[PDB]
Amino acid sequence: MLKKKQLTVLDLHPGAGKTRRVLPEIVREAIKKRLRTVILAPTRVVAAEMEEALRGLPVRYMTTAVNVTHSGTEIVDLMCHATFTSRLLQPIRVPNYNLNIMDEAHFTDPSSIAARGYISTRVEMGEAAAIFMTATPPGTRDAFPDSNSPIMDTEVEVPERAWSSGFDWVTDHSGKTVWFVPSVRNGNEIAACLTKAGKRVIQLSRKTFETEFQKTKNQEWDFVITTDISEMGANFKADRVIDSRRCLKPVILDGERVILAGPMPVTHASAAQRRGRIGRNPNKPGDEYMYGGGCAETDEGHAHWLEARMLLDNIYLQDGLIASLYRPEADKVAAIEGEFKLRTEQRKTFVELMKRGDLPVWLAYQVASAGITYTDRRWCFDGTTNNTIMEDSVPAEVWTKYGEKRVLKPRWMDARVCSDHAALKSFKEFAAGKR
Ligand SMILES: CN1CCN(C(=O)Nc2ccc(F)cc2)CC1
């Protein structure tokens, strides 16, 4: 596994012990062989669970999710997938790790795809070894993998709106349910319906994940309503998963705007990870998995793989060479390697728009490639009338940094900046020059 030029896919079933049993064994062996090693966690919650599994081993935690006093002699670093890609993009020196371990390697956010691309390229070059840990590698077609204990799988119509009748099985249950919804707005409606029926509901999404996930441990709950972020190693003490089997798909139209298409079917890998939240206790057989649709290969033409190419085109590898996507996921995007490579100043703007600006990769690239500087927000107001962002059925308005009230009408429209109330609030602050 640890030899140069080797990439191993550790694909044991969900709950088989990849993170808590296998990972410490690999790390102990890497330390014995003096391999400079990186361990990539998908989220801060996983980074904290990894410190518990690796306690006693000399690991440098490059995350504020863990409060540890680092000796300075560690040769094993642990950080999130996003932090690894961010440090590669920034002028900072990232060590040339001999062994690269990615946990929850199925993560399809642009920074995780780019991290796989870079690492797999280094392995192909003969410079490093890598281990990708996931039950569902790219292209898997099995939505029903093995589990620690038998699961009751039932195809059933699942509500995606508030309901008054016809779904008694949903509320008649007396255990704990994790329910996967296609979007934050859809979860808000279902959570309100369940709360009105007397249930205790916790909601999780990317922006609220670390904070709200703690509530699943600190208080009693009946339902967790979550987007796809809970496919990335989130553990619950639940006995049922309700799975809409739907997700939103960012799609670039005519190379000039991004829409959130769908809801549409999830991939088999997503379905297997959603189901994989339950059936984890060998002493509790009969956990239920209720699913409301089929799977499809909705990662084909999905914006995240084009965004991963934008990030890889702007990471130094060697001279003018550019890292390729990891081979099993390299056909998801029609893209030319190097087409998004930016000159030094525009690249710095692109990075700052993602890091400080908190903009989606595609949108950050359109602004930087137009030669616009980070603090110049005129583009948030000079788009066509059809790019007007709406707030409760009327044009959204902001006071510009000049003190003028203006309608929010970006030159490039990316639906992700206004997909929910929190996203629109953050984009309004950006349009106003507040960060
Ligand atoms: C609304 N989102 C929040 C998270 N986000 C991000 O994770 N970007 C990023 C891109 C590249 C990279 F390498 C690391 C992070 C910015 C936009």
Side-chain angles (χ1 to χ4, degrees), residues 183-235:
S183 68
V184 170
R185 289 188 174 160
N186 278 178
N188 290 336
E189 179 161 356
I190 295 166
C193 184
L194 296 161
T195 300
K196 178 156 154 191
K199 305 301 184 173
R200 299 163 293 190
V201 179
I202 292 166
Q203 297 172 245
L204 309 171
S205 74
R206 276 174 180 70
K207 288 289 188 178
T208 67
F209 199 71
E210 202 190 28
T211 306
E212 298 299 298
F213 181 81
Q214 183 65 29
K215 290 187 184 164
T216 68
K217 302 204 253 274
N218 192 47
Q219 65 198 59
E220 291 157 3
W221 51 271
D222 301 312
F223 283 79
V224 158
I225 288 292
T226 177
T227 68
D228 71 315
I229 189 58
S230 291
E231 290 164 22
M232 262 58 62
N235 287 325

Short mmCIF file of all heavy atoms in Angstrom, two decimals, residues 183-235:
data_model
loop_
_atom_site.label_atom_id
_atom_site.label_comp_id
_atom_site.label_asym_id
_atom_site.label_seq_id
_atom_site.Cartn_x
_atom_site.Cartn_y
_atom_site.Cartn_z
N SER A 183 -32.79 19.87 -1.03
CA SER A 183 -32.30 21.24 -0.84
C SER A 183 -32.65 21.77 0.55
O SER A 183 -33.53 21.23 1.24
CB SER A 183 -32.93 22.19 -1.89
OG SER A 183 -34.32 22.33 -1.63
N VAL A 184 -31.98 22.87 0.94
CA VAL A 184 -32.27 23.49 2.23
C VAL A 184 -33.73 23.98 2.29
O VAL A 184 -34.45 23.70 3.26
CB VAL A 184 -31.28 24.67 2.46
CG1 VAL A 184 -31.68 25.50 3.67
CG2 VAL A 184 -29.84 24.15 2.60
N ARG A 185 -34.21 24.64 1.21
CA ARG A 185 -35.59 25.14 1.17
C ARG A 185 -36.59 23.98 1.31
O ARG A 185 -37.58 24.08 2.04
CB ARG A 185 -35.86 26.01 -0.09
CG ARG A 185 -35.13 27.37 -0.02
CD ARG A 185 -35.53 28.31 -1.17
NE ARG A 185 -34.94 29.66 -1.03
CZ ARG A 185 -34.80 30.52 -2.03
NH1 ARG A 185 -35.19 30.20 -3.26
NH2 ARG A 185 -34.27 31.72 -1.82
N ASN A 186 -36.31 22.84 0.63
CA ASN A 186 -37.20 21.69 0.75
C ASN A 186 -37.18 21.15 2.19
O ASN A 186 -38.24 20.82 2.73
CB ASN A 186 -36.90 20.58 -0.27
CG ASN A 186 -37.48 20.79 -1.67
OD1 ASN A 186 -37.27 19.97 -2.57
ND2 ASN A 186 -38.22 21.89 -1.91
N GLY A 187 -36.00 21.09 2.82
CA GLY A 187 -35.94 20.61 4.21
C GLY A 187 -36.72 21.51 5.17
O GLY A 187 -37.34 21.03 6.12
N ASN A 188 -36.65 22.84 4.97
CA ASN A 188 -37.40 23.83 5.79
C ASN A 188 -38.91 23.51 5.81
O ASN A 188 -39.51 23.42 6.89
CB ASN A 188 -37.19 25.27 5.23
CG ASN A 188 -35.81 25.84 5.43
OD1 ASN A 188 -35.05 25.43 6.33
ND2 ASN A 188 -35.43 26.78 4.59
N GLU A 189 -39.50 23.21 4.63
CA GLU A 189 -40.92 22.87 4.54
C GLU A 189 -41.24 21.56 5.26
O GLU A 189 -42.18 21.51 6.06
CB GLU A 189 -41.37 22.79 3.07
CG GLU A 189 -42.83 22.40 2.93
CD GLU A 189 -43.47 22.73 1.59
OE1 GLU A 189 -42.79 23.34 0.74
OE2 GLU A 189 -44.65 22.34 1.38
N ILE A 190 -40.43 20.51 5.02
CA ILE A 190 -40.67 19.23 5.70
C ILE A 190 -40.46 19.35 7.22
O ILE A 190 -41.22 18.76 8.00
CB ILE A 190 -39.82 18.09 5.06
CG1 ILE A 190 -40.26 17.83 3.61
CG2 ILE A 190 -39.94 16.81 5.92
CD1 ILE A 190 -39.31 17.04 2.91
N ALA A 191 -39.44 20.10 7.65
CA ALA A 191 -39.17 20.27 9.09
C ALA A 191 -40.36 20.99 9.76
O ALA A 191 -40.83 20.56 10.80
CB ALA A 191 -37.89 21.05 9.30
N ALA A 192 -40.90 22.04 9.11
CA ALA A 192 -42.06 22.77 9.66
C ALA A 192 -43.27 21.84 9.81
O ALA A 192 -43.97 21.87 10.83
CB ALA A 192 -42.41 23.96 8.78
N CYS A 193 -43.48 20.97 8.82
CA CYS A 193 -44.58 20.02 8.87
C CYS A 193 -44.43 19.06 10.05
O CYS A 193 -45.37 18.84 10.81
CB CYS A 193 -44.71 19.27 7.55
SG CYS A 193 -46.12 18.14 7.47
N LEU A 194 -43.21 18.50 10.23
CA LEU A 194 -42.91 17.57 11.32
C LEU A 194 -43.01 18.28 12.66
O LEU A 194 -43.56 17.70 13.58
CB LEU A 194 -41.53 16.89 11.17
CG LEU A 194 -41.39 15.98 9.92
CD1 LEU A 194 -39.92 15.72 9.58
CD2 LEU A 194 -42.23 14.68 10.08
N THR A 195 -42.49 19.51 12.80
CA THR A 195 -42.59 20.26 14.06
C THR A 195 -44.05 20.54 14.46
O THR A 195 -44.43 20.36 15.62
CB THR A 195 -41.78 21.55 13.98
OG1 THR A 195 -40.41 21.22 13.74
CG2 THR A 195 -41.91 22.42 15.25
N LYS A 196 -44.90 20.87 13.49
CA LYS A 196 -46.33 21.08 13.73
C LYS A 196 -46.99 19.78 14.21
O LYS A 196 -47.95 19.81 14.98
CB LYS A 196 -47.00 21.58 12.44
CG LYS A 196 -48.51 21.79 12.54
CD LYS A 196 -48.99 22.80 11.49
CE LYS A 196 -50.43 22.62 11.09
NZ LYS A 196 -50.77 23.45 9.90
N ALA A 197 -46.47 18.61 13.76
CA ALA A 197 -46.99 17.32 14.20
C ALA A 197 -46.43 16.87 15.55
O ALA A 197 -46.72 15.77 15.96
CB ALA A 197 -46.73 16.26 13.14
N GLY A 198 -45.62 17.70 16.22
CA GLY A 198 -45.10 17.36 17.54
C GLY A 198 -43.72 16.72 17.56
O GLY A 198 -43.25 16.32 18.63
N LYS A 199 -43.03 16.69 16.41
CA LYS A 199 -41.68 16.08 16.37
C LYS A 199 -40.57 17.09 16.69
O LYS A 199 -40.72 18.26 16.36
CB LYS A 199 -41.39 15.47 14.98
CG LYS A 199 -42.43 14.45 14.50
CD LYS A 199 -42.58 13.26 15.46
CE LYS A 199 -43.58 12.27 14.85
NZ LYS A 199 -43.67 11.00 15.62
N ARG A 200 -39.42 16.61 17.22
CA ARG A 200 -38.22 17.42 17.47
C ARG A 200 -37.31 17.22 16.27
O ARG A 200 -36.92 16.08 15.96
CB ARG A 200 -37.55 16.97 18.77
CG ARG A 200 -38.49 17.17 19.94
CD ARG A 200 -38.03 16.36 21.13
NE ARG A 200 -38.16 14.92 20.90
CZ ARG A 200 -38.01 14.00 21.85
NH1 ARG A 200 -37.76 14.36 23.10
NH2 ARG A 200 -38.12 12.71 21.55
N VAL A 201 -37.04 18.30 15.55
CA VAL A 201 -36.31 18.23 14.31
C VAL A 201 -35.04 19.05 14.34
O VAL A 201 -35.08 20.20 14.77
CB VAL A 201 -37.22 18.71 13.15
CG1 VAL A 201 -36.47 18.66 11.83
CG2 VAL A 201 -38.52 17.89 13.08
N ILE A 202 -33.92 18.46 13.86
CA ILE A 202 -32.66 19.19 13.71
C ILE A 202 -32.43 19.27 12.20
O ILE A 202 -32.67 18.27 11.51
CB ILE A 202 -31.49 18.45 14.40
CG1 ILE A 202 -31.66 18.44 15.92
CG2 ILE A 202 -30.13 19.07 14.02
CD1 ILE A 202 -30.74 17.46 16.60
N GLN A 203 -31.96 20.43 11.68
CA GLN A 203 -31.70 20.54 10.25
C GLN A 203 -30.21 20.75 10.02
O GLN A 203 -29.59 21.56 10.72
CB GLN A 203 -32.48 21.70 9.59
CG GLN A 203 -34.01 21.52 9.65
CD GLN A 203 -34.72 22.77 9.16
OE1 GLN A 203 -35.43 23.46 9.93
NE2 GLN A 203 -34.57 23.07 7.88
N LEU A 204 -29.64 20.02 9.03
CA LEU A 204 -28.23 20.15 8.68
C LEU A 204 -28.07 20.50 7.24
O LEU A 204 -28.76 20.00 6.38
CB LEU A 204 -27.47 18.84 8.91
CG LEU A 204 -27.64 18.19 10.29
CD1 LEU A 204 -27.02 16.77 10.31
CD2 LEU A 204 -27.07 19.09 11.36
N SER A 205 -27.08 21.33 6.97
CA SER A 205 -26.71 21.72 5.61
C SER A 205 -25.23 22.12 5.66
O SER A 205 -24.67 22.20 6.75
CB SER A 205 -27.59 22.86 5.09
OG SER A 205 -27.25 24.10 5.70
N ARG A 206 -24.59 22.38 4.51
CA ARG A 206 -23.17 22.72 4.50
C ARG A 206 -22.79 23.89 5.40
O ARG A 206 -21.83 23.78 6.16
CB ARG A 206 -22.70 22.99 3.06
CG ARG A 206 -22.33 21.70 2.29
CD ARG A 206 -22.01 21.98 0.81
NE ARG A 206 -21.66 20.77 0.05
CZ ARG A 206 -22.52 19.80 -0.27
NH1 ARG A 206 -23.78 19.86 0.12
NH2 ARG A 206 -22.11 18.76 -1.01
N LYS A 207 -23.55 24.99 5.32
CA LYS A 207 -23.22 26.19 6.08
C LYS A 207 -23.39 26.05 7.57
O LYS A 207 -22.69 26.73 8.31
CB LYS A 207 -24.02 27.40 5.58
CG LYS A 207 -23.55 27.88 4.23
CD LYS A 207 -22.19 28.54 4.35
CE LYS A 207 -21.73 29.21 3.09
NZ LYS A 207 -20.42 29.86 3.32
N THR A 208 -24.31 25.21 8.01
CA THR A 208 -24.59 25.05 9.43
C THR A 208 -24.06 23.76 10.06
O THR A 208 -24.25 23.55 11.25
CB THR A 208 -26.11 25.07 9.62
OG1 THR A 208 -26.67 23.89 9.02
CG2 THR A 208 -26.76 26.33 9.02
N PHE A 209 -23.45 22.87 9.25
CA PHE A 209 -23.02 21.53 9.65
C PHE A 209 -22.27 21.40 11.00
O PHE A 209 -22.81 20.69 11.85
CB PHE A 209 -22.20 20.84 8.55
CG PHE A 209 -22.17 19.35 8.78
CD1 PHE A 209 -23.31 18.58 8.58
CD2 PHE A 209 -21.02 18.72 9.23
CE1 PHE A 209 -23.29 17.22 8.84
CE2 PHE A 209 -21.01 17.35 9.48
CZ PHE A 209 -22.16 16.62 9.31
N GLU A 210 -21.07 21.99 11.21
CA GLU A 210 -20.38 21.75 12.51
C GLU A 210 -21.21 22.09 13.73
O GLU A 210 -21.31 21.28 14.66
CB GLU A 210 -19.00 22.41 12.62
CG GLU A 210 -18.15 21.71 13.67
CD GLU A 210 -16.86 22.41 14.06
OE1 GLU A 210 -16.79 23.66 13.95
OE2 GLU A 210 -15.91 21.70 14.48
N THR A 211 -21.82 23.29 13.70
CA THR A 211 -22.63 23.77 14.82
C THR A 211 -23.85 22.91 15.10
O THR A 211 -24.06 22.47 16.24
CB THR A 211 -23.00 25.25 14.61
OG1 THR A 211 -21.81 26.00 14.37
CG2 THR A 211 -23.80 25.82 15.77
N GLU A 212 -24.69 22.68 14.07
CA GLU A 212 -25.93 21.93 14.27
C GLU A 212 -25.70 20.45 14.51
O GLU A 212 -26.53 19.82 15.19
CB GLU A 212 -26.89 22.14 13.10
CG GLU A 212 -27.32 23.58 12.91
CD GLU A 212 -28.07 24.15 14.10
OE1 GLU A 212 -29.15 23.63 14.44
OE2 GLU A 212 -27.55 25.12 14.70
N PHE A 213 -24.61 19.86 13.95
CA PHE A 213 -24.35 18.43 14.15
C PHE A 213 -24.16 18.11 15.65
O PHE A 213 -24.63 17.07 16.11
CB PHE A 213 -23.17 17.91 13.27
CG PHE A 213 -22.94 16.42 13.46
CD1 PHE A 213 -23.72 15.49 12.80
CD2 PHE A 213 -22.00 15.97 14.37
CE1 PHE A 213 -23.54 14.13 13.02
CE2 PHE A 213 -21.83 14.61 14.59
CZ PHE A 213 -22.57 13.71 13.89
N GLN A 214 -23.59 19.06 16.43
CA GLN A 214 -23.41 18.87 17.88
C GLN A 214 -24.74 18.61 18.60
O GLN A 214 -24.78 17.84 19.57
CB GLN A 214 -22.66 20.07 18.49
CG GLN A 214 -22.36 19.94 20.00
CD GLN A 214 -21.40 18.82 20.35
OE1 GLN A 214 -20.53 18.44 19.56
NE2 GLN A 214 -21.55 18.27 21.57
N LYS A 215 -25.85 19.19 18.08
CA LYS A 215 -27.18 19.02 18.65
C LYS A 215 -27.66 17.58 18.59
O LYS A 215 -28.45 17.17 19.44
CB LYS A 215 -28.21 19.92 17.96
CG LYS A 215 -28.01 21.40 18.26
CD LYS A 215 -29.17 22.19 17.67
CE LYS A 215 -28.98 23.68 17.85
NZ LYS A 215 -29.90 24.42 16.94
N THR A 216 -27.19 16.79 17.59
CA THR A 216 -27.59 15.38 17.51
C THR A 216 -27.04 14.58 18.69
O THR A 216 -27.60 13.54 19.04
CB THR A 216 -27.15 14.77 16.18
OG1 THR A 216 -25.71 14.69 16.14
CG2 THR A 216 -27.69 15.54 14.96
N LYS A 217 -25.97 15.09 19.35
CA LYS A 217 -25.35 14.46 20.50
C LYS A 217 -25.83 15.06 21.84
O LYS A 217 -25.95 14.33 22.83
CB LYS A 217 -23.82 14.64 20.42
CG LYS A 217 -23.21 14.07 19.15
CD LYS A 217 -21.75 13.74 19.37
CE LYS A 217 -20.82 14.71 18.68
NZ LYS A 217 -20.56 14.31 17.27
N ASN A 218 -26.04 16.38 21.88
CA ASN A 218 -26.40 17.11 23.12
C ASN A 218 -27.88 17.09 23.49
O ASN A 218 -28.20 17.42 24.63
CB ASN A 218 -25.91 18.57 23.04
CG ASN A 218 -25.97 19.34 24.37
OD1 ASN A 218 -25.55 18.87 25.43
ND2 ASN A 218 -26.51 20.56 24.32
N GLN A 219 -28.77 16.77 22.55
CA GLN A 219 -30.20 16.76 22.86
C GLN A 219 -30.97 15.60 22.22
O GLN A 219 -30.48 14.99 21.26
CB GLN A 219 -30.86 18.11 22.52
CG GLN A 219 -30.84 18.44 21.05
CD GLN A 219 -31.08 19.90 20.77
OE1 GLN A 219 -30.34 20.79 21.22
NE2 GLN A 219 -32.10 20.19 19.98
N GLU A 220 -32.14 15.28 22.77
CA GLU A 220 -32.98 14.23 22.20
C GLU A 220 -33.68 14.79 20.95
O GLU A 220 -34.10 15.94 20.91
CB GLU A 220 -33.98 13.72 23.24
CG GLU A 220 -33.30 12.93 24.36
CD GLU A 220 -34.06 12.85 25.67
OE1 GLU A 220 -35.20 13.38 25.74
OE2 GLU A 220 -33.52 12.26 26.64
N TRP A 221 -33.75 13.98 19.91
CA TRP A 221 -34.39 14.37 18.65
C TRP A 221 -35.17 13.20 18.07
O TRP A 221 -34.93 12.05 18.44
CB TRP A 221 -33.33 14.85 17.65
CG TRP A 221 -32.17 13.93 17.44
CD1 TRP A 221 -31.00 13.91 18.15
CD2 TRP A 221 -32.01 12.97 16.38
NE1 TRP A 221 -30.13 13.00 17.61
CE2 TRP A 221 -30.71 12.43 16.50
CE3 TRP A 221 -32.82 12.55 15.32
CZ2 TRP A 221 -30.22 11.46 15.61
CZ3 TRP A 221 -32.32 11.60 14.44
CH2 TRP A 221 -31.04 11.07 14.59
N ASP A 222 -36.11 13.51 17.17
CA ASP A 222 -36.92 12.50 16.49
C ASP A 222 -36.51 12.45 15.02
O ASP A 222 -36.45 11.36 14.45
CB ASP A 222 -38.41 12.88 16.56
CG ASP A 222 -38.89 12.99 18.00
OD1 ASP A 222 -38.60 12.07 18.81
OD2 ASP A 222 -39.53 14.01 18.32
N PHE A 223 -36.19 13.62 14.41
CA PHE A 223 -35.80 13.64 13.01
C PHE A 223 -34.60 14.53 12.79
O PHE A 223 -34.51 15.59 13.42
CB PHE A 223 -36.93 14.20 12.13
CG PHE A 223 -38.07 13.24 11.87
CD1 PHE A 223 -39.04 13.02 12.82
CD2 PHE A 223 -38.18 12.59 10.65
CE1 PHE A 223 -40.11 12.15 12.57
CE2 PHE A 223 -39.24 11.72 10.40
CZ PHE A 223 -40.19 11.49 11.36
N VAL A 224 -33.72 14.11 11.88
CA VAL A 224 -32.65 14.96 11.37
C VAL A 224 -33.02 15.15 9.88
O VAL A 224 -33.25 14.15 9.19
CB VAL A 224 -31.23 14.37 11.53
CG1 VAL A 224 -30.25 15.00 10.52
CG2 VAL A 224 -30.75 14.56 12.96
N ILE A 225 -33.16 16.38 9.44
CA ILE A 225 -33.49 16.71 8.05
C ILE A 225 -32.18 17.22 7.49
O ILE A 225 -31.66 18.23 8.00
CB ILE A 225 -34.59 17.81 7.98
CG1 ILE A 225 -35.96 17.25 8.40
CG2 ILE A 225 -34.62 18.49 6.60
CD1 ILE A 225 -36.56 16.25 7.44
N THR A 226 -31.61 16.53 6.48
CA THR A 226 -30.29 16.92 6.00
C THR A 226 -30.18 16.93 4.49
O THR A 226 -30.83 16.14 3.80
CB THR A 226 -29.25 15.97 6.60
OG1 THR A 226 -27.92 16.26 6.12
CG2 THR A 226 -29.57 14.49 6.34
N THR A 227 -29.28 17.78 3.99
CA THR A 227 -28.95 17.75 2.57
C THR A 227 -27.87 16.61 2.39
O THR A 227 -27.52 15.90 3.36
CB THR A 227 -28.44 19.14 2.12
OG1 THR A 227 -27.16 19.35 2.75
CG2 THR A 227 -29.44 20.26 2.41
N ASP A 228 -27.30 16.48 1.18
CA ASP A 228 -26.31 15.45 0.84
C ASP A 228 -25.01 15.54 1.67
O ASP A 228 -24.24 14.59 1.66
CB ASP A 228 -26.01 15.49 -0.67
CG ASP A 228 -25.23 16.72 -1.07
OD1 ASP A 228 -25.59 17.84 -0.60
OD2 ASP A 228 -24.27 16.57 -1.85
N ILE A 229 -24.78 16.66 2.44
CA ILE A 229 -23.52 16.76 3.21
C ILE A 229 -23.39 15.62 4.26
O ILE A 229 -22.26 15.21 4.59
CB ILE A 229 -23.39 18.17 3.88
CG1 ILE A 229 -22.00 18.38 4.49
CG2 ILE A 229 -24.51 18.40 4.92
CD1 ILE A 229 -20.84 18.23 3.48
N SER A 230 -24.54 15.04 4.70
CA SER A 230 -24.45 13.95 5.67
C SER A 230 -23.99 12.62 5.04
O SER A 230 -23.83 11.65 5.77
CB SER A 230 -25.74 13.79 6.46
OG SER A 230 -25.91 14.91 7.33
N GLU A 231 -23.76 12.56 3.70
CA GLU A 231 -23.17 11.35 3.08
C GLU A 231 -21.66 11.22 3.44
O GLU A 231 -21.03 10.22 3.09
CB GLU A 231 -23.26 11.46 1.54
CG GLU A 231 -24.67 11.35 1.00
CD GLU A 231 -24.82 11.83 -0.44
OE1 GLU A 231 -23.81 11.87 -1.18
OE2 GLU A 231 -25.96 12.18 -0.83
N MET A 232 -21.05 12.29 4.00
CA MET A 232 -19.61 12.33 4.19
C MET A 232 -19.15 11.98 5.59
O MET A 232 -18.45 12.76 6.23
CB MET A 232 -19.04 13.70 3.74
CG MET A 232 -18.47 13.68 2.35
SD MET A 232 -19.61 13.17 1.04
CE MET A 232 -20.90 14.46 1.17
N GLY A 233 -19.53 10.80 6.05
CA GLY A 233 -19.03 10.28 7.31
C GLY A 233 -19.72 10.75 8.55
O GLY A 233 -19.17 10.60 9.65
N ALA A 234 -20.93 11.32 8.41
CA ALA A 234 -21.70 11.80 9.55
C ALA A 234 -22.35 10.59 10.21
O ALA A 234 -23.09 9.88 9.54
CB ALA A 234 -22.79 12.75 9.07
N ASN A 235 -22.09 10.36 11.50
CA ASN A 235 -22.65 9.23 12.23
C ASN A 235 -23.79 9.64 13.15
O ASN A 235 -23.69 10.63 13.90
CB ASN A 235 -21.57 8.49 13.00
CG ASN A 235 -20.66 7.68 12.10
OD1 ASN A 235 -21.09 7.12 11.08
ND2 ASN A 235 -19.39 7.63 12.46
#
